[PDB]
Design a binder for this molecule. Structure first.
Ligand code: CLA
Ligand code: CLA
Ligand code: CLA
Ligand code: CLA
Ligand code: CLA
Ligand code: CLA
Ligand code: CLA
Ligand code: CLA
Ligand code: CLA
Ligand SMILES: CC1=C(C/C=C(\C)CCC[C@H](C)CCC[C@H](C)CCCC(C)C)C(=O)c2ccccc2C1=O
Ligand code: SF4
Ligand code: SF4
Lengths: 163, 40, 64, 80, 106, 730, 141
């Protein structure tokens, strides 16, 4: 553990919160009959709730005095105390997806501007071209460093200034 | 048909197909492997 | 001939202009001693909606 | 009591003169342009500072600018 | 539907049923008229889709194929007689019939 | 009427009256001005603001001594409530005077919220006579300054321009005398007077020469045994007034708080202002003034130019830019003063310097909120007055290649990066709050994204807090930083920080994480709104020459797609909305986190501050119960004045929306219609205005509506802050 | 023109019942404007202040309180009916001034007699910064 936080398995308030959230459904389940569809819906919600709590405990999460799980952000403490999947690993997952959107839109912009009437290509897209680039962007990091090391990424003082 | 495909290539329509894909993909990703928070 | 050639692209150097450090086609050039003879046409509009403007010899330079 | 200054980039379009309602702009001959015309601002005492003229100017940047300043009865457009 | 969260909105309304509580008054409208079963609502829905396509067809017909002239539109006096007697008059007389033969006996 | 401007006097409308007030103290734009007459008129006016300060302080002393309960408060500071000033409102009824007479005084009164009672009591004031004597002293000092502003304006006694532009002499005299000697004397007061008054001894003008502060006297000071003054410090079991548990020390380095009065030791603060006097006197002897020794300011700036050329020419050409530009000097002063004003807010609540201030919950709030709100207003002025420099007092050819031109050259990069930070901070902060608002709503409070602020908890562990268990150097006994300062400050410091019943380094959770991130978004975006109005003050692509028009103008017209709100004044105008929004969050976070501490239930904030409905339910709606019942149909309590003000703010805030939303053109056509009626009416037409009526200008309405907007944004919270905290008394 | 036409203060006015957009106390005290024109037939036209009025065959005369009210009418007559109006300025003292076709030719057409005014021989921009003129008025002049 770290930062004076208990694991969620050993916490009492964590189990208190489980017994509470299930008690609401059991009271709500008493109204309806056993074989009815409202009964099946609530039993599934009961099954999901029981699964949500045990999985968060199994994953070595850290619960505070309030009883709710807390996340850790420094990769040093995350890797040292086995909490990397929380924040440190979600960061790489998103950046790969965010870069993919940039490398794709940047290429559609450059290529349509090499032809006549690029304004029409923005409001009326070339879907065959857009899908081609969208399935060619799996290795977007390679092309970026290829384009940076080459020097064809940035423009050089051919841009408008104001003074 | 050439003009119909061109209408379908407008911005309002291509965006509609994008939205059904991204929203359909995420809702389907929550229906199976329900309510994710920590990534294993 | 006094100035750049017809149909030649040139780069602008007016600091005031919307098209500064940008490229445009030379539409025409007047050789009657006018202060701002060089007529230039750009694809992109300015804020008002005008895509042409008469520039001078010193205010224009070769492309890129 | 507004200020109206016209600059060297005028081309003799006359669109500034046609626009301003209060007849504060007129055309004068000149040797600088193809049209051999230039504007002028003899009577700015009647300038209401509407700034319609600047809109008419079709140059890269305005050859006609209306620098607002001290107000008056004629400038404030007061019928009373 | 049953997705992340959401289902709690299907409250314990009553009647062996759980869902969102409406405030449109449709149930009191369908009871003021003679409606006891769900089969009467299904037919009523299929009629609207049939009449709606007729409406949409009309707009294509009255514009793309056979469109009236300006003279037809300026016959304002004709429009008032048809709108007053035909639409508001017979429309109300018709409703009375349904109320007398269905909305009252039910 | 404006004599300083003939252009407005010729104006026949009411615009003359409004613009005459707003351009009153703008000396640069006046008619017939000169650079020499400018500095003199400023120097005389700056004497005036001193005269109002010393009088404003004199009024509080008199109105407290004459009408307050300072003599009764010292005997029982905790239970007795202070009294600011009495009330005489003949429109009252009998139930109100019975409710507003809660104090021991006969008539109705207003309970104080500033905290001057705790301050005066600490420095050795224990009677109402001593406040009467003081109120006379400042009123004399106030009159002296008024006489000087007039005297130093006369034909003689009129300083020359070279005298104002002598920076090296001003620094040395102001750093050494105004800062140092004043700090040295304040130590002379704490030693000769205040510490004795704490330990029972009555020291005053009658007996300060006969009474020694220390038994030994000054013989340790000359001999070099300076540790004799720290021998017998005050014990923990020490009453602040009586000699029970006293000591003989005058300078000590105990650290921490005094046990009974949760406040800093007086002997420490005496030792503090002494060392500050030494550094500031030493720094005062730095620059060169009429003797061979000393540094020169211009020689330094010209020298600090890096060789490679990362900064080009460097800091060259800047001395004549700063020394000649008053707006430059004013932006730096506000920037520095604005920041300091926030330190006063952040460092007082954590380190109470006064006696029985930690217990006065209502007083800590007001002081923290008042300093924080002023901090933002002062900070906004520094940028705004920094933008005017670029228009009026900036010379590009002189400042060529230097740092100031190299910043202005690539401004598109700065404004771009600032925009990205605000966008990323805003999208993520709003998202986390929403994601938790929903997932709470579906009954699953465990699916929230609660991230622990590990980096801040790492500091508190490195500063003595053993809760988190990081076991850092200063939380570890083996480290040298614990070994050093073990005899000095750490026993008193470690006891306080580890105590979880004070505001010194409060516990942090994931709720405090989101609030800090939300603040960052406000600070970054507020700077972006201001920075843009400064750098783009000289010109934009939409308006290449803003500099010719001025700082404040309407617009350039409906041409070029529309140019409404381009001027740098309109950037400052929009930043104030964000400023108030930023300080609001900062202040909402202080109040609730402290209420839960004072009420004892800290779990309220930790669990509910993670989702927005907690802020609306548990903080706003809940604590607005005793306040709203100030005047009920059954009766009225003492909080009726606050509920009335409560609404008064809600109303003023809404009236500004008129001037903001509805523009001029709707109104001027309306005033033309009333003018027609006034002339066509049979008898009223005989009366005729002297100045023609016209609607308010464009820029005037932006100003007026912002005043109605900010006053409601302050009067509303002040009532809520004082009423919520006063009614619960915790 | 060849010569300035002096004002005939007694000419028939159009047929107009009246309105509330007329002249106020400013007119008798400070100044007011009057416009003249010559029509070939009887027509209907929109007034700047108020509603519709009927012109009269021959000379016509109106009185207004603003120059914009007069020039607003010239633009209507020159475009719709293709006429040539001329308007003056009358002070309270009785003095009269002939304003708009001051040269006889409308301003949108050149004439050799005119002389330029407020003509800077430089480009927009390209002018001194305000610091150079910090203590007197004007950066553009
Ligand atoms: C390929 C499209 C594209 C690309 C590559 C970029 C890239 C960039 N933008 Mg950006 N932007 C875009 C579209 C794009 N933008 C659009 C459509 C808008 C209008 C909403 C903006 C508004 C915007 C602002 C206000 C700012 C940026 C900024 C930036 C820079 C920092 C990243 C950022 O936080 O931006 C912000 C990201 C967004 C606002 C999200 C954009 C919306 C989607 C996610 C992207 C559009 C993709 C496109 C529609 C798909 C076409 C693909 C094609 C095959 C059909 C960065 C270099 C910041 C900057 O100045 O850098 C310092 C900044 O302040 N952008
Ligand atoms: C976006 C506009 C809008 C929307 C969304 C709704 C929605 C709704 N309306 Mg409403 N309505 C509207 C506009 C709208 N209305 C307007 C402008 C009027 C003024 C005429 C009415 C008059 C109206 C009435 C009188 C009633 C509703 C009712 C209802 C509710 C039941 C829906 C229904 O099918 O009942 C169907 C409605 C009926 C079967 C009876 C309609 C009787 C009216 C008087 C017919 C008049 C039609 C006539 C030819 C048009 C006016 C003639 C012209 C000369 C003025 C529902 C919540 C009903 C309700 O309360 O729900 C319980 C209800 O009685 N509406
Ligand atoms: C050391 C402090 C200091 C000093 C010496 C100055 C000096 C100056 N400032 Mg500056 N300023 C300061 C701090 C300071 N300022 C701060 C902190 C800010 C940020 C808020 C500003 C923001 C600022 C702006 C935005 C402008 C100036 C301007 C000026 C110039 C004078 C304008 C004038 O005469 O206005 C006189 C104005 C008034 C008399 C009207 C003030 C009325 C206030 C707003 C109403 C307050 C509300 C009301 C009384 C509340 C009552 C409560 C009710 C319930 C009873 C002058 C150089 C102006 C300038 O230089 O123009 C180029 C200008 O435009 N200043
Ligand atoms: C303590 C604050 C303070 C100080 C020191 C001054 C000082 C001054 N004011 Mg000022 N003034 C103030 C507050 C203050 N004013 C407020 C709050 C208002 C609004 C009611 C005004 C409205 C005002 C006007 C309208 C005028 C002055 C003028 C003056 C100058 C008169 C010469 C003596 C002097 C510099 C006069 C001036 O411009 O002198 C040069 C002048 O005409 N002041
Ligand atoms: C700026 C300083 C300052 C301020 C704000 C006040 C404010 C006030 N004084 Mg005060 N006063 C002051 C300095 C000040 N005093 C000084 C220096 C003296 C000594 C002469 C007095 C002597 C004084 C008397 C004798 C009285 C007031 C009274 C008042 C109140 C009357 C209402 C009003 O319009 O004022 C008000 C609370 C009157 C009152 O009834 O207070 C409740 C009253 O009778 N004052
Ligand atoms: C930072 C310096 C400083 C400050 C703010 C104070 C503040 C105070 N002292 Mg203290 N004191 C100081 C230094 C200081 N002292 C030093 C160095 C000593 C050692 C001698 C003392 C010894 C002392 C005694 C013995 C007594 C005080 C008392 C007081 C209190 C009332 C004073 C009063 O009403 O004026 C009354 C003022 C006079 C009788 C005349 C003062 C004469 C000086 C030399 C004039 C200074 C004017 C100064 C230049 C003003 C600045 C403006 C300038 C441009 C003109 C007040 C809290 C009295 C008290 O009751 O406190 C508990 C008291 O009896 N003080
Ligand atoms: C512009 C982005 C940004 C900004 C302005 C801030 C600003 C702030 N953060 Mg912070 N933070 C950020 C991003 C950001 N953060 C990210 C992406 C994470 C990981 C999810 C964190 C995790 C974090 C924690 C755990 C804590 C703070 C805290 C703070 C406050 C004190 C500074 C500090 O020590 O934090 C750290 C400063 C940084 C991490 C700078 C990194 C910003 C990078 C360059 C942007 C993202 C790059 C991308 C991920 C790759 C401060 C106001 C502390 C606090 O809450 O105060 C009590 C604290 O405990 N932050
Ligand atoms: C709470 C905010 C607020 C207030 C107080 C007002 C008030 C008013 N509005 Mg606005 N309105 C508002 C919000 C507000 N509006 C907003 C945000 C918008 C934006 C859409 C509009 C847009 C708007 C428009 C377009 C118009 C109005 C009009 C009016 C005026 C109508 C005449 C009237 O009833 O006055 C009566 C007086 C009052 C209602 C004030 C009530 C408070 C009491 C009675 C005053 C007490 C005075 C006190 C005894 C004297 C103290 C003196 C002291 C110095 C000692 C009125 C002054 C209309 C107008 O002005 O033309 C007639 C106009 O057409 N409103
Ligand atoms: C039409 C009804 C109405 C209206 C129009 C208002 C309007 C207003 N009320 Mg109000 N109020 C009302 C009813 C109403 N109230 C009722 C019925 C009650 C209970 C009796 C209250 C009790 C109340 C209190 C106690 C207060 C107000 C305040 C305010 C003003 C704050 C405005 C603002 O923008 O500040 C800024 C708005 C915010 C800072 C956000 C609002 C609160 C959020 C949720 C806190 C979030 C902080 C945290 C950092 C998260 C945000 C970060 C973000 C990035 C996610 C405002 C003008 C406040 C005030 O006086 O202004 C200072 C104030 O303290 N009201
Ligand atoms: C109502 C309104 C007016 C008209 C408002 C007027 C004419 C009211 C001002 C005059 C009254 C008589 C002053 C009322 C007295 C004040 C309550 C106290 C003023 C105190 C000062 C003397 C210090 C505008 O001119 C305007 C202009 C631009 C945007 C919005 C608006 C706008 O909303
Ligand atoms: S400010 Fe208005 S009235 Fe004056 S010249 Fe320009 S367009 Fe004409
Ligand atoms: S400020 Fe008013 S007049 Fe000026 S551009 Fe904006 S809307 Fe038009």
């Amino acid at each position: 553990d770290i930062a004076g936080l208990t694991p969620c398995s050993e916490s009492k308030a964590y189990n208190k919160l489980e017994r509470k959230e299930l008690k609401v459904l059991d009271k709500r389940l008493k109204q309806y009959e056993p074989g009815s569809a409202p009964y099946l819906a609530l039993q599934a919600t009961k099954e999901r709730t029981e699964n949500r709590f045990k999985t968060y405990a199994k994953q070595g999460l850290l619960c505070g005095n309030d009883g709710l799980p807390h996340l850790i952000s420094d990769p040093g403490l995350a890797l040292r105390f086995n909490h990397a999947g929380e924040v440190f690993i979600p960061t790489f997952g998103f950046l790969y997806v965010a870069g993919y959107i940039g490398h794709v839109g940047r290429q559609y912009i450059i290529l349509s501007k090499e032809d006549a009437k690029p304004t029409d290509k923005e409001i009326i897209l070339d879907v065959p071209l857009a899908l081609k680039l969208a399935f060619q962007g799996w290795a977007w990091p390679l092309a970026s460093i290829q384009e940076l090391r080459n020097g064809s990424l940035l423009e050089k003082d051919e841009n408008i200034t104001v003074s | 048909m050439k003009d119909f495909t061109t209408y379908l290539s407008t911005a309002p329509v291509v965006g509609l197909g994008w939205a059904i894909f991204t929203s359909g993909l995420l809702i389907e990703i929550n229906r199976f492997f329900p309510d994710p928070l920590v990534f294993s | 001939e006094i100035g750049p050639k017809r149909g030649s692209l040139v780069k602008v150097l007016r600091p005031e202009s919307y098209w500064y450090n940008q490229v445009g086609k030379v539409v025409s050039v007047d050789q009657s001693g006018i202060r701002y003879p060089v007529v230039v046409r750009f694809e992109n509009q300015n804020y008002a909606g005008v895509s042409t403007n008469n520039y001078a010899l010193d205010e224009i330079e070769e492309v890129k | 009591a507004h200020v109206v200054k016209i600059y060297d980039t005028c081309i003799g379009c006359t669109q500034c003169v046609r626009a301003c309602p209060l007849d504060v702009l007129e055309m004068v001959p000149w040797d600088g342009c193809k049209a051999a015309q230039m504007a002028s601002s003899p009577r700015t005492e009647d300038c209401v500072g509407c700034k319609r003229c600047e809109t008419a100017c079709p140059t890269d940047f305005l050859s006609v600018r209306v620098y607002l300043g001290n107000e008056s009865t004629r400038s404030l457009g007061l019928a009373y | 539907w049953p997705i992340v969260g959401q289902e709690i909105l299907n409250g314990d309304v009553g009647g062996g049923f759980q869902g969102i509580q409406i405030t449109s008054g449709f149930f009191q409208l369908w009871r003021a008229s003679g409606i006891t079963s769900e089969l009467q609502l299904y037919s009523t829905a299929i009629g609207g889709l049939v009449l709606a396509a007729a409406c949409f067809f009309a707009g294509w017909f009255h514009y793309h194929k056979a469109a009236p002239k300006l003279e037809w539109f300026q016959n304002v006096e004709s429009m008032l007689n048809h709108h007053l007697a035909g639409l508001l008059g017979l429309g109300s007389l018709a409703w009375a019939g349904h109320q007398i033969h269905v909305s009252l006996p039910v | 009427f404006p004599k300083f401007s003939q252009g407005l006097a010729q104006d026949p409308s009411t615009r003359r009256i409004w613009y005459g007030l707003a351009t009153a103290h703008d000396f640069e734009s006046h008619d017939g001005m000169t650079e020499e007459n400018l500095y003199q008129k400023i120097f005389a006016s700056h004497f005036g603001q001193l005269a109002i300060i010393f009088l404003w302080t004199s009024g509080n002393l008199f109105h407290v001594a004459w009408q307050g309960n300072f003599e009764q408060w010292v005997t029982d500071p905790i239970h007795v409530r202070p009294i600011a000033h009495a009330i005489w409102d003949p429109h009252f009824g009998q139930p109100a005077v019975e409710a507003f007479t809660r104090g021991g005084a006969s008539g109705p009164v207003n309970i104080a919220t500033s905290g001057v009672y705790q301050w005066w009591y600490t420095i050795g004031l224990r009677s109402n006579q001593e406040l009467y004597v003081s109120s006379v002293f400042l009123a004399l000092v106030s009159a002296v300054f008024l006489f000087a502003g007039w005297l130093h304006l006369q034909p003689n006694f009129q300083p020359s321009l070279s005298w104002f532009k002598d920076a090296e002499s001003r620094l040395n005299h102001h750093l050494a005398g105004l800062f140092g000697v004043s700090s040295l004397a304040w130590t002379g007061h704490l030693v000769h007077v205040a510490i004795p008054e704490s330990r029972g001894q009555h020291v005053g003008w009658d007996n300060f020469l006969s009474v020694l502060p220390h038994p030994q006297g000054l013989t340790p000071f000359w001999s070099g045994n300076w540790a004799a003054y720290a021998q017998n410090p005050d014990t923990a079991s020490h009453a602040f007034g009586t000699a029970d548990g006293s000591g003989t020390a005058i300078l000590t380095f105990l650290g921490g708080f005094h046990p009974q009065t949760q406040s800093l030791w007086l002997s420490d603060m005496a030792h503090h202002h002494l060392a500050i006097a030494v550094l500031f006197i030493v720094a005062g002897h730095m620059y060169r003034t009429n003797f061979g020794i000393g540094h020169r300011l211009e020689a330094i700036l010209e020298a600090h130019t890096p060789p490679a050329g990362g900064l080009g020419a460097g800091h060259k050409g800047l001395f004549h830019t700063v020394n000649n530009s008053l707006h430059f000097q004013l932006g730096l002063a506000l920037a520095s003063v604005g920041t300091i004003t926030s330190l006063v807010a952040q460092h007082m609540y954590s380190l109470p310097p006064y006696a029985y201030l930690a217990v006065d919950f209502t007083t800590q709030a007001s002081l923290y909120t008042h300093h924080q709100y002023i901090a933002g207003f002062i900070m906004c002025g520094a940028f705004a007055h920094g933008a005017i420099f670029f228009i009026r007092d900036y010379d590009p050819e002189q400042n060529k290649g230097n740092v100031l031109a190299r910043v202005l050259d690539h401004k598109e990069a700065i404004i771009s990066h600032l925009s990205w930070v605000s966008l990323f901070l805003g999208f993520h902060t709003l998202g986390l709050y929403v994601h938790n608002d929903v997932v709470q709503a579906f009954g699953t409070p465990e699916k929230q994204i609660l991230i622990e602020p590990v980096f801040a908890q790492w500091i508190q562990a490195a500063q003595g807090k053993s809760l988190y268990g990081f076991d850092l150097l200063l939380a570890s006994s083996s480290s040298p930083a614990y070994s050093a300062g073990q005899s000095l400050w750490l026993p008193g410091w470690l006891e306080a920080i580890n105590n979880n019943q004070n505001s010194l380094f409060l516990t942090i959770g994931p709720g405090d994480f989101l609030v800090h991130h939300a603040i960052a978004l406000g600070l970054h975006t507020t700077t972006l709104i201001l920075v843009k109005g400064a750098l783009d003050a000289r010109g934009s692509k939409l308006m290449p020459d803003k500099k010719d028009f001025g700082y404040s103008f309407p617009c350039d017209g409906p041409g070029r797609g529309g140019t409404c709100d381009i001027s740098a004044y309109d950037a400052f105008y929009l930043a104030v909305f964000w400023m108030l929004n930023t300080i609001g969050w900062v202040t909402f976070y202080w109040h609730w986190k402290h209420l839960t501490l004072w009420q004892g239930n800290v779990s309220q904030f930790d669990e509910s501050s993670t989702y927005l409905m907690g802020w609306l339910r548990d903080y706003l709606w809940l604590n607005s119960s005793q306040l709203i019942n100030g005047y009920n149909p059954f009766g009225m309590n003492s909080l009726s004045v606050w509920a009335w003000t409560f609404l008064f703010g809600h109303l003023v805030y809404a009236t500004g929306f008129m001037f903001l939303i509805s523009w001029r053109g709707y109104w001027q056509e309306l005033i033309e219609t009333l003018v027609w009626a006034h002339e066509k009416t049979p008898l009223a037409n005989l009366v005729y205005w002297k100045d023609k009526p016209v609607a308010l200008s464009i820029v005037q309405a932006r100003l007026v509506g912002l005043a109605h907007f900010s006053v409601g944004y302050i009067f509303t919270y002040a009532a809520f802050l004082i009423a919520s905290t006063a009614g619960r008394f915790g | 023109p060849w010569k300035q036409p002096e004002l005939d203060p007694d000419t028939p006015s159009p047929i107009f019942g009246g309105s509330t957009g007329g002249l106020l106390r400013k007119a008798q005290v400070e100044e007011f404007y009057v416009i003249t024109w010559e029509s070939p037939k009887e027509q209907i036209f929109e007034m700047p202040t108020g509603g519709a009025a009927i012109m009269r065959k021959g000379p016509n005369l109106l009185k207004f309180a603003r120059k914009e009210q007069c020039m607003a009418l010239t633009t209507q007559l020159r475009s719709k009916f293709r006429q040539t109006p001329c308007f003056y300025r009358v002070y309270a003292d009785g003095k009269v001034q002939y304003l708009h076709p001051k040269d006889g030719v409308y301003p949108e057409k050149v004439n050799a007699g005119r002389v330029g005014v407020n003509q800077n021989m430089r480009s927009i921009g390209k002018n001194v910064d305000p610091i150079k003129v910090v203590k007197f008025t004007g950066s553009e002049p």
